[PDB]
């Protein structure tokens, strides 16, 4: 379900990608010429010299990994690169503060957007009927029936693999007698209402809410 | 953070070098802050985002119809479709199918996967 | 019956007028009531038991002067006995009565302890009448006063007075 | 052990740089980036999810006891009490005291409120004007402007008390806090003028002086309900925090028991975060809990029990149980507190602002032969040109000045700048160009397209001069990706929901950015240059 | 049985608190070194074992 939620919001992550792109290019053009030397943090591993390198540095900052030492190393006064025929900008505050405040925001925006898209599942009593029970019924139905070949086909009550949750006082017989059987079980096992007229009520509810074969659904 | 917690515990007096563990009580200032701005107020923050998203989502509450679980139930009128399993026909091709489709096979193969990882 | 040229206005208040917690609310409403109806409302203070009304030696001549001033062309009557419509509705004077009530029974004692503890023991006697005022249905509670601040209830009192004028 | 150190995202980048040195820069980044993304961000999203699910179950199960109804009843009661005390106080004014019936209206008047807000701002500016070695005139300015503001704030303390009822003025929580802060100011005057004042005094007294900035943020109502709920449920916040404190005490006593005095290595005493005594053990356990140098505090914990061996290096169990079941309990505590008090304190808002509004409502050129055709092929060609332009500026070479690739990218920039001027010319046929109601300007995205294109062209114009001005005009051409926001009907929805989120969140951001100002000012008081070292 | 009727549970909780405070003051010196305070805390510790074993028997 989380994979589905992630794949159902391809644009909340696109925003994070756009932010990484923007800040990678900005850091490229401003801090690109700092001198690569160790004992600092703009070194042979961290630098804004190529786009992959800058994106790695920004991923390092986003996970909060001594980003302040990079920030202090990109402050002005640093020797410039030799391939450049001094360098270092004081923008390095606004570049590294804001980034951390932006990513850490857009991350949360992403996470919650994925949580709450999915919030139907995360809060769930696991007792009242849910997709798990319906799919378990689908597989047992396939166990007692080959591919799409069940119309009545029933002379047995061996359908007790339906656990206590949806023969107590033969209410199983009442439910069975009173895809069509799937929808009948859906309506009855919920036991929403009991008035003796709920078949026509189900008819009108399905008509108003709905799109498919309703000539068999109510019976 | 801890590189600064210990420059500010050694902190002595205006324009004077450090003294080892001059004041450990200063750590309180760095604890309260950490509890307030980093822990409490940036979890108030995600809590606020969560509750706001839930409000943005309950706009389509639609209380005229009943609770949400029956909404998923009625949306699952699209179930009860066939699933391919290829029940065997040949007798030489059914014994193997049965033995490989029994749980006796899957337990063993979980055991072998674990042994290969080991 | 027939209107005595105007509807006499008395204010029941949250409780008995003999204790400051209530009569202060009456004065507070009366000041603002009088300062916006010049030539439209005459305020008078009555003391005798006008509950015993016909339409006691002191009470003998008390009732008629209210009608006399009502004919003068609405009129505010300030009493010390009308603490419920029942002790005033037995006779059909056809008045309009301002029905002050507090929506909660729990702020009353907090108001009681406010200024001084000398009055404290009367809180029950304070509260019972409010309880005895609580269950009265709106049709005999014609003036509905629910809210907190004066500045809006004073505007609320404006509207009731223009059914005829 | 190394992978688990990476997952917690501290020490992640070392073990990547060491591997980069060992086996080259090429592949290892896949391993470690994927490890962080799958195993750190994703399984933190899952944890936030499961916790929020449990908390939304507990909220609904909290509709059995109806604690929210208790909070609402208390809120209405405390509103009504002051509302009726207004009736009483306005009654008392019928030893002539004609002054009060005017000074009360002055109090309620917005001019006085804005005056006492401007005074708060001056107080802040006299506090924030701290400085390492400020000129000697600034010190006397701050002293006199502190005395004057304290005297005035006491003046509008007593004026507010006497224009209302004392027994009514103390009803409001805010005024009870304000009386406290001005009393703290008076105590400050006493201590500083008697000269018996101590560094703890210069801390707490100036601290309460800062707290007077809370005189702002009293209109704002969502945070008012939030604070009301926090003060309602303090019996549970205290319990949760106290249980956390006991967990930390246990994991610090065990810390001293296992690593007490075992950190003495002949190397220079760089081990500041030892486990020696109890206060220095609490700081170390807290540092592990927040996970700052969890590595080093575990490598020292290991190398104390012999090097990496079998009996030794089972002292990773301590620093792993700690980092697991301390961050879990931190997240649980500080999300239960921050959701069960921020979803009920938003119910207050949704049930009283609604109620109050319901209460008040119930009381009451050429325009011929154009070509806007084929807007379904431009709407994709422009995307597949913006993407290539974005990659184009992603492919520049900073370190070399006259790079071979840079000339080719300049040629691409020529082509793309011309093509992106083509659509600007095209949309003349569409209504706009400050003509026809100015339909051009009503939608800022088209203007932004023109703006970034115009900058890419102004850089060209300056390039003939070839001067360092373009040094900025180059950088801003990073704006090119944002054009997609206009051209992707899906991306527009997300980038608008983000702004809606910002506006809805704004109160919390304001509280936090105003509550960091107090900590900045206290830090300035405490460490105003006491951090040097030779 | 009637001992637990009496509210001593407060005194046993105060014993727990005194044990926490006895553990806080104990400085773990590197190699068997000790000061006077660590010497006294061991006698106080025998006291705490006594007061815990007694209540163990009772409960
Ligand atoms: C925004 C999304 C951007 C996606 C970027 C994906 C890039 C894939 C190819 C990158 C590549 O070529 O890897 C090698 C790179 C640099 O190689 P290097 O040897 O150090 O350069 C000096 C040559 N004399 O070495 C690297 O460090 C690449 C690191 C890339 C990290 C990407 C993180 C994505 C989040
Ligand atoms: C054996 C593995 C047991 C579970 C390990 C879970 C590790 C947590 C996920 C990775 C991580 O990023 O941890 C750091 C996280 C705080 O990280 P951050 O918010 O960036 O600061 O801190 C956390 O999220 C702690 C999460 C604790 C989960 C406990 C699960 C029940 C035990
Ligand atoms: C005002 O920010 C602060 O004082 C903070 C500062 C600067 N340092 C740290 C790291 C904090 C922080 O977590 O930054 C957050 C990161 C996520 C986005 N957050 C809001 C935001 C959204 C979009 C654009 C910009 C900002 C800012 C506090 C803080 C704690 C808790 C809540 C909070 N808040 O802004 O609500 C802020
Ligand atoms: C001789 C005593 C000097 C130290 C007194 C206390 C200073 C250190 C207190 C550390 C508190 C940290 C709290 C950890 C999280 C609750
Ligand atoms: C000299 C050795 C070259 C080996 C090249 C391997 C490339 C990929 C290795 C890392 C892939 C890890 C994926 C993690 C699971 C998604
Ligand atoms: C509430 C607004 C605060 C603005 C004033 C504080 C910032 C400037 C004061 C310190 C500047 C020192 C520069 C050297
Ligand atoms: C929870 C697992 C982490 C720690 C497990 C303990 C492993 C101890 C042995 C590892 C090293 C053995 C000796 C290597 C040669 C120096
Ligand atoms: C409830 C109060 C507990 C305070 C401490 C209790 C135990 C203290 C015993 C030893 C105190 C240290 C001094 C040792 C003699 C010089
Ligand atoms: Ca970290
Ligand atoms: Ca670090």
Numbering used by the authors:
A (entry chain D): 1400 to 1484, 1494 to 1574, 1582 to 1593, 1607 to 1638, 1647 to 1655
B (entry chain D): 1137 to 1254
C (entry chain C): 222 to 276, 297 to 314, 316 to 407
D (entry chain D): 354 to 447, 509 to 778, 889 to 943, 964 to 1078
E (entry chain D): 119 to 177
Paper excerpt:
The structure of the CaV1.2 channel complex is composed of a pore-forming α1 subunit and auxiliary subunits α2δ1 and β2b. Its α1 subunit consists of four repeat transmembrane domains (DI−DIV).
Unlike the pore-blocker tetrandrine, benidipine does not directly block the pore but allosterically inhibits CaV1.2. The main moiety of dihydropyridine is biased towards DIII. The nitrogen atom on the pyridine ring forms a potential hydrogen bond with S1132P1. The nitrogen atom on 9-nitrophenyl and the oxygen atom on 5-dicarboxylic acid of the pyridine ring form hydrogen bonds with T1056S5III and Q1060S5III, respectively. Whereas similar interactions with T935 and Q939 have been identified in the structure of the CaV1.1 complex, benidipine also contains a phenylmethyl piperidinyl group, which is positioned in a hydrophobic pocket formed by residues I1046S5III, I1049S5III, V1053S5III, F1181S6III, M1509S6IV, and F1513S6IV, providing additional hydrophobic interactions to stabilize its binding, in line with the inhibitory IC50 of benidipine being approximately ten times smaller than that of nifedipine. Although benidipine does not inhibit mutations T1056Y, Q1060M, and Q1060F as potently as it does in WT CaV1.2, it still retains the ability to block the current. The hydrophobic sidechain of benidipine provides extra interactions with the channel subunit α1, supporting the inhibition of both L- and T-type voltage gated calcium channels.
